[PDB]
Amino acid sequence: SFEEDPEISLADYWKCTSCNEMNPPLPSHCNRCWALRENWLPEDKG
Ligand SMILES: [Zn+2]
């Protein structure tokens, strides 16, 4: 199922490393197990 989403395409989604679920960029944790993403915010070590 795909709908009009030019502002937020499903391609921008992410893959929860816990269960391997797909989620949008809006949230951070998987919408099932709540596997709060790890690599989201701008990670700039140094
Ligand atoms: Zn998950």
Swiss-Prot record:
Start and end residues, zinc fingers (RanBP2-type): 10-39
Residues that, per the record, bind Zn(2+): 16, 19, 30, 33
Tissue: Ubiquitous. Isoform Mdm2-A, isoform Mdm2-B, isoform Mdm2-C, isoform Mdm2-D, isoform Mdm2-E, isoform Mdm2-F and isoform Mdm2-G are observed in a range of cancers but absent in normal tissues.
Modified how: Phosphorylated at multiple sites near the RING domain by ATM upon DNA damage; this promotes its ubiquitination and degradation, preventing p53/TP53 degradation. Autoubiquitination leads to proteasomal degradation; resulting in p53/TP53 activation it may be regulated by SFN. Also ubiquitinated by TRIM13. ATM-phosphorylated MDM2 is ubiquitinated by the SCF(FBXO31) complex in response to genotoxic stress, promoting its degradation and p53/TP53-mediated DNA damage response. Deubiquitinated by USP2 leads to its accumulation and increases deubiquitination and degradation of p53/TP53. Deubiquitinated by USP7 leading to its stabilization.
Induction of the gene: By DNA damage.
Protein origin, superkingdom: Eukaryota
Location(s), subcellular: Nucleus, Nucleoplasm; Cytoplasm; Nucleus, Nucleolus; Nucleus
Involvement in disease: Seems to be amplified in certain tumors (including soft tissue sarcomas, osteosarcomas and gliomas). A higher frequency of splice variants lacking p53 binding domain sequences was found in late-stage and high-grade ovarian and bladder carcinomas. Four of the splice variants show loss of p53 binding. Lessel-Kubisch syndrome: An autosomal recessive progeroid syndrome characterized by short stature, pinched facial features, prematurely gray hair, scleroderma-like skin changes, small kidneys and consecutive kidney failure, followed by severe arterial hypertension.
Record family assignment: Belongs to the MDM2/MDM4 family.
Subunit structure: Interacts with p53/TP53, TP73/p73, RBL5 and RP11. Binds specifically to RNA. Can interact with RB1, E1A-associated protein EP300 and the E2F1 transcription factor. Forms a ternary complex with p53/TP53 and WWOX. Interacts with CDKN2AIP, RFWD3, USP7, PYHIN1, and RBBP6. Interacts with ARRB1 and ARRB2. Interacts with PSMA3. Found in a trimeric complex with MDM2, MDM4 and USP2. Interacts with USP2 (via N-terminus and C-terminus). Interacts with MDM4. Part of a complex with MDM2, DAXX, RASSF1 and USP7. Part of a complex with DAXX, MDM2 and USP7. Interacts directly with DAXX and USP7. (Microbial infection) Interacts with herpes virus 8 protein v-IRF4.
Role noted for this protein: E3 ubiquitin-protein ligase that mediates ubiquitination of p53/TP53, leading to its degradation by the proteasome. Inhibits p53/TP53- and p73/TP73-mediated cell cycle arrest and apoptosis by binding its transcriptional activation domain. Also acts as a ubiquitin ligase E3 toward itself and ARRB1. Permits the nuclear export of p53/TP53. Promotes proteasome-dependent ubiquitin-independent degradation of retinoblastoma RB1 protein. Inhibits DAXX-mediated apoptosis by inducing its ubiquitination and degradation. Component of the TRIM28/KAP1-MDM2-p53/TP53 complex involved in stabilizing p53/TP53.
Further comment found in the protein's record: MDM2 RING finger mutations that failed to ubiquitinate p53 in vitro did not target p53 for degradation when expressed in cells.
Domain notes: Region I is sufficient for binding p53 and inhibiting its G1 arrest and apoptosis functions. It also binds p73 and E2F1. Region II contains most of a central acidic region required for interaction with ribosomal protein L5 and a putative C4-type zinc finger. The RING finger domain which coordinates two molecules of zinc interacts specifically with RNA whether or not zinc is present and mediates the heterooligomerization with MDM4. It is also essential for its ubiquitin ligase E3 activity toward p53 and itself.
Protein name: E3 ubiquitin-protein ligase Mdm2
Gene: MDM2
